[PDB]
Amino acid sequence: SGFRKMAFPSGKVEGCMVQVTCGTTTLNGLWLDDVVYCPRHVICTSEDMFNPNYEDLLIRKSNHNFLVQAGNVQLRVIGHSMQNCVLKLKVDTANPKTPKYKFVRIQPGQTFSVLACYNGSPSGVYQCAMRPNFTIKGSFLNGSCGSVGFNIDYDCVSFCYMHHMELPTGVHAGTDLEGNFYGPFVDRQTAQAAGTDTTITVNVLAWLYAAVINGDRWFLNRFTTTLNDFNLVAMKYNYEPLTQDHVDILGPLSAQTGIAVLDMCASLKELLQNGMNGRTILGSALLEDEFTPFDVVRQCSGVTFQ
Amino acid sequence: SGFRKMAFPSGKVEGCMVQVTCGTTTLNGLWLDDVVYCPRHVICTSEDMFNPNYEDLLIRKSNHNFLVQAGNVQLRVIGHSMQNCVLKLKVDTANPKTPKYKFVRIQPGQTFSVLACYNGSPSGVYQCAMRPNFTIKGSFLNGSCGSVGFNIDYDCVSFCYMHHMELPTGVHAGTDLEGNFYGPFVDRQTAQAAGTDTTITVNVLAWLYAAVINGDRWFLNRFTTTLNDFNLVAMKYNYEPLTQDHVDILGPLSAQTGIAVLDMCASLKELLQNGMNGRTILGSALLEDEFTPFDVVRQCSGVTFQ
Numbered sequence A, B: 001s002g003f004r005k006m007a008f009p010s011g012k013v014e015g016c017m018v019q020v021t022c023g024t025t026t027l028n029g030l031w032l033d034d035v036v037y038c039p040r041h042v043i044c045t046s047e048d049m050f051n052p053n054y055e056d057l058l059i060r061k062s063n064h065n066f067l068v069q070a071g072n073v074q075l076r077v078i079g080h081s082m083q084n085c086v087l088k089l090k091v092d093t094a095n096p097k098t099p100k101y102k103f104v105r106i107q108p109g110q111t112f113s114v115l116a117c118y119n120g121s122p123s124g125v126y127q128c129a130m131r132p133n134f135t136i137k138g139s140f141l142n143g144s145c146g147s148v149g150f151n152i153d154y155d156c157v158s159f160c161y162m163h164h165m166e167l168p169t170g171v172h173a174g175t176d177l178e179g180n181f182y183g184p185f186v187d188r189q190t191a192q193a194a195g196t197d198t199t200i201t202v203n204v205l206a207w208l209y210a211a212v213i214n215g216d217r218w219f220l221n222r223f224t225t226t227l228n229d230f231n232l233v234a235m236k237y238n239y240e241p242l243t244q245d246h247v248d249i250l251g252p253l254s255a256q257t258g259i260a261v262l263d264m265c266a267s268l269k270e271l272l273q274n275g276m277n278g279r280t281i282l283g284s285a286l287l288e289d290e291f292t293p294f295d296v297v298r299q300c301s302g303v304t305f306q
Helices: A054-060 A201-213 A227-236 A244-257 A261-274 A293-301 B054-060 B201-213 B227-236 B244-249 B251-257 B261-274 B293-299
Strands: A017-022 A025-032 A035-039 A066-070 A073-075 A077-083 A086-091 A101-103 A111-118 A121-129 A148-153 A156-166 A172-175 B017-022 B025-032 B035-039 B066-070 B073-075 B077-083 B086-091 B101-103 B111-118 B121-129 B148-153 B156-166 B172-175
Touching: A017 A035, A017 A121, A025 A066, A035 A156, A054 A077, A066 A077, A066 A086, A111 A156, A121 B293, A201 A244, A201 A261, A201 A293, A227 A261, A244 A261, A244 A293, A293 B121, B017 B035, B017 B121, B025 B066, B035 B156, B054 B077, B066 B077, B066 B086, B111 B156, B201 B244, B201 B251, B201 B261, B201 B293, B227 B261, B244 B251, B251 B261, B251 B293
Parallel strands: A101 A156, B101 B156
Antiparallel strands: A017 A025, A017 A066, A025 A035, A035 A086, A066 A073, A077 A086, A111 A121, A111 A148, A148 A156, A156 A172, B017 B025, B017 B066, B025 B035, B035 B086, B066 B073, B077 B086, B111 B121, B111 B148, B148 B156, B156 B172
């Protein structure tokens, strides 16, 4: 019982976090086997900011220009290259605490745990969703660049996000671990702004299911509706359209509660049109959209057939 | 910028979690040096829970009745004893990952991180608060007992909670690591239930500061009030009293924002009576009380000594 914004245990990623210095710029890197990955913007000075020439800046740097520290231990850089916006520093020592891992690119609507770090030292861990407009609503201060987001999928650490920057609305933008930005952003100081966001409908429904599992029922009505009619209401309140895939994805939560997906859709329609009757659901006074169906399952159901 | 429910990195605590089986009950234990700490109710069958005499149930048990497992490696139990409601199993092997640690007893209002575990395997990490009525609104499933809560100062893990049971309302009760329960609860199947809970006023205020710091201002007014007047309003709405110790603790944030504490109390008062008239603060439509002033400062680092 209970429901909380729960992140994955951070231990396997903590052991990969390093500090990377280039001139007067320090930020975080991720150390897997004999490679440290970090934002390429660490090689910039204030004079590069206008039109940074990364290709040129990279070749002009020697291995010695990169100070890499894992705790107190200095790692020697023996090579440097660039994949898109991520810098790959080859080092002389392979990380003995390298977990089994993969680099994955997540989709909008999906969540992951962020390990916020500073000077290569983990500060804290929290859950984020990739917003439909490809930002995350994170929590980062100066020196957090290079912090990474991940999921634990079986035994495997699936790394999906590396932090690059804050946009002027206070939201956050970054790349996958191959250095490609989520969204239409670039790793330089230019006029760029988040597109308008939408609410992740399938996640809201999952969160409602979570409420039902934990004994919140007041918003349940006896109504059912159709995909089509639901989607018309969705659009009116800036909610992403719902698809059959979404309906399928909610199946596990339907079975737990005995509430058909389309019935929960009718309950959601009613909360949208008429509000939340001054009540809270799972310690919140608005409709939460940053929990996937899987996040609800992993927290509230597990492997229960019974 | 940004503000999130953020937990400490769980790595140091992950390396201490182990499984403890006695009979058909499996739950979690904490392995520090050559001692495993777990809830003493691991030795009870379902029947014993009604009226259990642990002193007597313990006599029935030999060392061989406890199977302790760190991953797959069996730790031989060579001693078993009992301090209040926690069992201490002396094992043959000292935990090589034992971090620097203290046992501390926290007070209502203070926050900590929970490493939710199952069969000695970490599942997730989230932030909680010791409620004024000595419960926590955690998120636990079957097999979570013996999961622990902690703060991390430097490399020092301060353990403050071990999880023992779910009360009927879905909220959670447990002990410090010396086995004393928080609040008047007991490890027996009885009529017992949580006292009625109140909101943690000083936390709400810290959060409001966090909001100002992150650009949310609409709830500010120009009024000032006094402690006395404020506390009268507090009492009406089941807020905890605000003391002058709380007023000083908020001095840093008052300074940073240039909003006097009693000014902020006046803003809260208005929110308290009248609500948020359809607006949000830090992405929430209610008053959050699970961030301490310290939690706020950690995510909203000042520029004083930057």
